[PDB]
Design a protein around this ligand. Structure first.
Ligand SMILES: [Cl-]
Ligand SMILES: [Cl-]
Ligand SMILES: [Cl-]
Ligand SMILES: [Cl-]
Ligand SMILES: [Fe+3]
Ligand SMILES: [Fe+3]
Ligand SMILES: [Fe+3]
Ligand SMILES: [Fe+3]
Lengths: 420, 419, 423, 414
């Protein structure tokens, strides 16, 4: 079977989320509870609430269980609290990153290079060169510029072989959005047959296009971690390349799969929103619905097809980076079905051979709304929204007050921008 | 007297235009610029938002090499059939006032400032040199860099204490609810204490986590257009120096005291951040006549504005929250109070030396915000503006088709949950 | 002042409002509860609740004739699980909201709640005028919502009085009246009988307003309570007098006449923006306490009767008291009176006079701006529900879950901007 | 292939145009018609405080005095010409006001295969009902008729045999309204309710009203009446010889199939959008609307939880199809305009397939999206206050429409 769902592995991170009113002396009453239980002001933030203006929002990221199981009791009865845990005990919500900076916590929790069947296994250089890229990811923290790497001549050859063979297929097999950005990457990035572009230059390009940014990663994270990073429009990226012995095969993601399959789509604004809704749906979702999201991600982002007029084309990264399947998925051999998440979430699939079937999406805006509807069925005691101004996640139990405030803004832009 | 500072070798010249990829657009245009000795480093081509078949172009040029550029605009408009807006900043005929297209572009004219014998501090090598030290930090500051921290002298902390202690006693009763709501937070996470001056870096990081607002060092006073323009990006140009210790209760210029105690606490409230942002957004490309009008509104709202809080009135203007005398005078029955109406406030005359004879009372920040939005329409501009926090760029909307797409995002945004 | 306190009849109208679920079989359980008492079915309505496929809305319109059979029914509905009820009465005040009509037809109930009976009236020593007034009173007392307004042949002495007021005022409208007035007036001259030498019929006028903004006229004998008069505006109904001032002093009238109402009020009701504004005032009066009715009467005074509006760099008048008064229309635009910006929190309590000209006037930025101020003031009025008018069914909707209906209005209006703008 | 689409037959010629008040337009226009010709209305525009809307009600008679006006209005100083017939570059005529529904309400017995053909009484009794419709005008109360005992029996046979199936086969909305119709409208096995009492009931629920009609109108006319929430209704009844068959709509089909749904507001809004979509639509798109109407209002099914039920009038008034559509025999597809609008169907035999709508609110928005696909130089919205249609052709009408929306966002938030 070998599905793409990777369970999350874990001192388990324990974080709290709660807001309180300023009617009685609230800041003093809460801060003293933390100082008395050996908690400095560095593991607690107090920010104003946007939904009432007379409330404070509190964030705690705590290693110290006996000093933590006592605050929850005194805090809940004497006055709403959401407990986030990485080990996901009962009566708790699965932990998720509240700010882009918190992505640094579990960015190095990949599994296991060390696979005997890997193409480049009987190679001391390649096996060692992989450790170099892994160290870049393990030591990278948010905000930092992605360290640049000088690719060897033997490695640019592999890139060239994959680049030239796929560039000939994009004009006819890739969706319009792909061919819309690709010329830009050829001019403003090092997207050339005889050059490998640096992830830093690409990240800076995405940031100026849709706000998406890249993050080095050593290997494969848990599905929870990966999708969680999409809520912040952060895409964990590998910096290594396949072994030059078989440029047309890879059991794992490499810079080729992600630069030629993933990056161009994240440059489109409509697609950035769609993929973001998938990540947003994973924040605090149980493991049962994470696998469902991983399956949707598989049949939409990696191996998804889209309707373009009277014809169909491909937009999945797994398809746009594979020379053989990109032609097989567009033929009349595979089975095509309309995109319906209730069926895709449970559909079984394989990772070794080509996909027997493909799901066709009407559009990205159409697929986006399907994710929102599916996000509602996911049992969560709150709603989530991303704030690009502060780059934090907003926990929303009365989420309805914020969506309306966004409409009142968008509507005043249609009557003001009235040229004629 | 007035607070309006008019805008003043290498005048920034920028173009704005979008094009369709019908046959080949990128190559045909890029060659048009390369043929006129324009390196690609001075041109960006990014996909247009709301339009999947258009490219958006950004150019970063100077007044230099204009004659090889005034010909390109003609080939883009007549030979291609597309709309183009020329930004020149130097009242070029048939041109739009230049404005920053990206937050990074704030670095261009951040040093375009204009030593007074009558100044509280006089020409004395000690103080004047300390002032030049802060000026060098601002001239050398860039958007990405962290604000350099400074070790304030005891003589400077003493002055801060005099202003801090005397004003803290009035905030609980004279300042609006939003002010007293944030101030306790600034005392813990920014070090707002009688015997300490907080660093703009620690403060800037605090606003970013509250409403996304960030601080920027400045040596002196910018043009009203330049200063207000930075508000569109929720960027507040901030001074790092402090008044001379001889007269702690007087300052002819803004200082770190005026900026930390008058301006910063309000920028921590999102409702106020949106309001102040609409003022900056309204200034992008506005004629000089309407820039002065916006400077007057900013004066009577952000600097010297009053707000209704229930059956009583309180103050939220920076000019009041940093002045010990006027903060008490504005709440008395001596000054004249009017309802906030921009058509009357935009033309109202005012003074900067003495207290304000009158004050304008705003119903709320969300109400005052929409009043600016309505006023933004009266400003003659060939386009509308909106800020994109994801990419930190301004999106110009000139084509009607861009609005039809904007309507789709709204009709879909009608989530009728109804429980 | 113009505030007239509300007076109830011996048979004070008592009506109930409540919705219930069809889970336990409510139609039978509720309908039978009334059948057990001396309550006829004809005085009970059961209608489906919109957006709640499993709820029925119930309306009952009775009075104190059967009180002992009514104080027991209300208890079974409120105390038992499944039903919330609002009791509307004209004067109990214990646990009831001030009564208001739920349907346009119910305006017939208190349409005859009148207080020419003043000795000092200009036409007092006149058997004809004194008698002619009773003739108009019978028309109002006998008028019902469905009937067409009876036409009357005005005497030549009465056409002359109208002409005196018409000619002297028409010369001032082009320069003193707001843009909306001079926009409608030419139409009234062509499609109605707005001429110097003719008095138009209220029926012809009512039909004209209905085709403009849906407003309709209703004959009235005299002065109603402020609640009754204002209440009728929620249905875009304007109570109108059909008589005319005495010809002895065409330039003076202590009471409203067809001149004040045809030349002052109707032309504004033809504009949608003003019709919506005045409607929000009526909507704000439904179920409002007597203390807030007087406050509402003051707003109406400084807006509809004696209100001024901003028109560009200049200001013009739109109040009916000014558009029908020859002296005040010139005095309000001069520099003698004091002008203040319109703020309901200030206007609601401002004192005023009715005999002499107004010392001050309130200037509104626009009709849409004044409308939103009334909505804001409507929230401060203590009411256990919100109100909205349904022009399709011509009924009032009591709304505690009002938030569910506003969304359907936005989602429709927005989907109409994408159909035309599909270019 | 028997179809339900009835082409329009002739002719009413009407004009629509707006003008500004800055220049002397009202005077210039009023003299323009008198100089070339009295039946003209001028009302203020509800979207521009400085514009007037003009309505003219003339016949094709005296055409040469009209072909000159169109040039002076278009070339000098926007105008839409409505012609009951296909004139080149003109929009199909549609009623602008509820009163205009009276014009072609008579634009429709002697049929050998009719059940009651060999009966002078029934054949004559039908002309009695036709005279009521031909002479009926808007605003009038629907004349009541005393139904004969022979006719009440026919109603009873259909009523009792179908009432037993509604609780299990009819949608939730139907059984929600039906108990009310039994008490306040007299829906009983041994009594036929009068259209006047029923119309008054619908008006108080969703504003829908009934209008007598002699026979079958053109699809445009019938659908057009739905834009005003007006439902053209037949007052006669099928011949008592075969109570379970009728080649035409009768009071049974209309009271038991159609009326109860019009009492639900969500359905009233949905059906109204269909009528609104037909105003000024070409003949090609009228048939498409007639097909959609067929598979939604007449023979439409809806999802009710994990089960499926029927809400179409053709099923709720037919004893055989009401059981056949739920018997898993026909094939069911999701409601999609591109597929349903062109699907062919029959009227004689049961339907081979049925289209399932998620809900009434879901089907309504699909029509609105489809309303854009109809080529029209304007958009339409209904004003219940004045009961006329608002044409939106000029850009100025939309900027004002944007203000009323942004302002309509009242954030009470408690
Ligand atoms: Cl966005
Ligand atoms: Cl925001
Ligand atoms: Cl309206
Ligand atoms: Cl409605
Ligand atoms: Fe991948
Ligand atoms: Fe300042
Ligand atoms: Fe009056
Ligand atoms: Fe039918």
């Amino acid at each position: 079977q070998e599905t793409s769902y990777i369970e999350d592995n874990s001192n388990g991170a324990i974080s709290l989320i709660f807001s309180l009113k300023e009617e009685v002396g609230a800041l003093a009453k809460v801060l003293r509870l933390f100082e008395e239980n050996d908690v400095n002001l560095t593991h607690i933030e107090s920010r104003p609430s946007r939904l009432k203006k007379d409330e404070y929002e509190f964030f705690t990221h705590l290693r110290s269980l006996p000093a933590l199981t006592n605050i929850i009791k005194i805090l809940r009865h004497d006055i709403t609290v959401h407990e986030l845990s990485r080990d996901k005990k009962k009566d708790t919500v699965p932990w998720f990153p509240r700010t882009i900076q918190e992505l640094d916590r579990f960015a190095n929790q990949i599994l296991s290079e060390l696979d005997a069947d890997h193409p480049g296994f009987k190679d001391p250089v390649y096996r060692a060169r992989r450790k170099q890229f892994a160290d870049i990811a393990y030591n990278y923290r948010h905000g930092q510029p992605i360290p640049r790497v000088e690719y060897m001549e033997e490695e640019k050859k592999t890139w060239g072989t994959v680049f030239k063979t796929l560039k000939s297929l994009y004009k006819t097999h890739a969706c319009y959005e792909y061919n819309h950005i690709f010329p830009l990457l050829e001019k403003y990035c090092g997207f050339h047959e005889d050059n490998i572009p640096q992830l830093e230059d690409v990240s800076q390009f995405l940031q100026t296009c849709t706000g998406f940014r890249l993050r080095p990663v050593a290997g494969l994270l848990s599905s929870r971690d990966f999708l969680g990073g999409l809520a912040f429009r952060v895409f964990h990226c590998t910096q290594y390349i396949r072994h030059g012995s078989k440029p047309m095969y890879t059991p794992e993601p490499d810079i080729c799969h992600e630069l030629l399959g993933h990056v161009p789509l994240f440059s489109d604004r409509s697609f950035a929103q769609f993929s973001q809704e998938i990540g947003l749906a994973s924040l605090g979702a149980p493991d049962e619905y994470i696998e469902k999201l991983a399956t949707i991600y598989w049949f939409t982002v990696e191996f998804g097809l889209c309707k373009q007029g009277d014809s169909i084309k491909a937009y999945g990264a797994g398809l746009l980076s594979s020379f053989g399947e990109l032609q097989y998925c567009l033929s009349e051999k595979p089975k095509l079905l309309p995109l319906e998440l209730e069926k895709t979430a449970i559909q079984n699939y394989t990772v070794t051979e080509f996909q027997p079937l493909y799901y066709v999406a009407e559009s990205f805006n159409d697929a986006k709304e399907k994710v929102r509807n599916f996000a509602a069925t996911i049992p969560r005691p709150f709603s989530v929204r991303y704030d690009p101004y502060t780059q934090r996640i907003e926990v929303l139990d009365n989420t309805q007050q914020l969506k309306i405030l966004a409409d009142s803004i968008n509507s005043e832009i249609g009557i003001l921008c009235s040229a004629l």
